[PDB]
Amino acid sequence: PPLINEDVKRTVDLSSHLAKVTAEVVLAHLGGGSTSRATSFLLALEPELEARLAHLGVQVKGEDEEENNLEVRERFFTVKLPVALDPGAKISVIVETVYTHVLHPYPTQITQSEKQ
Amino acid sequence: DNLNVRETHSLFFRSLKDRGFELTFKTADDPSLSLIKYGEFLYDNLIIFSP
């Protein structure tokens, strides 16, 4: 159950009027003990953008989408893997999120013949 | 005007700072000088001692 992510590549798209960030994260399980449980893995969000989330989705290898349950820890999202991983195996997961109302216009008062 | 004027006007500026203002001294001909930046008014009070 204690595991780390080996390589994470995240791309943020700002060319829309809403920000879409996609993170390819490879979960690896440190081979300590024979506890092969490793079923659900936590997902977290920064506090400043908590209220600005729209739709969170997880896709693996391009295959069927997994299911994520909102979770509270004494917000978080728990993700149930299809096949639990034994210690010493890597799974490639893709986390894609969309944030709405996150690009504020800075000049905030723009004439007709200007740029934004 | 000459950046040495602050020395010979010290009393006024010491009083002004003692009241609680943040004083920035520049020379009237300075390339980095501006009031608005993207419509912000980054300086709330202006003082011209440069005839």
CA distance A41 to B27: 60
Say which experimental method was used: cryo-EM
Those residues whose C-beta lies under 8 Å from the C-beta of residue A69, and which sit 6 or more positions away, are A77, A78, A80
- Best of B36, B37, B38, B41 to disrupt the A interface (most A CBs within 10 Å) is B38
CA distance B36 to A61: 51
Q: Map tokens 């943020």 to a residue.
A: A12
CA distance A79 to B48: 63
Determine the residue of chain B that is closest to A116 in CA distance. B38
Q: A109: which chain B residues are within 8 Å (Cβ-Cβ)? A: 39
CA distance A100 to A116: 18
Give domain limits for chain A.
Answer: 1-116
Residues in chain A, total: 116
Asked if the C-beta of A112 comes within 8 angstroms of chain B's C-beta atoms, the answer is no
**Chain A nearest C-alpha distance from B42 (Å):** 13
Neighbours of A19 (CB within 10 A): 19
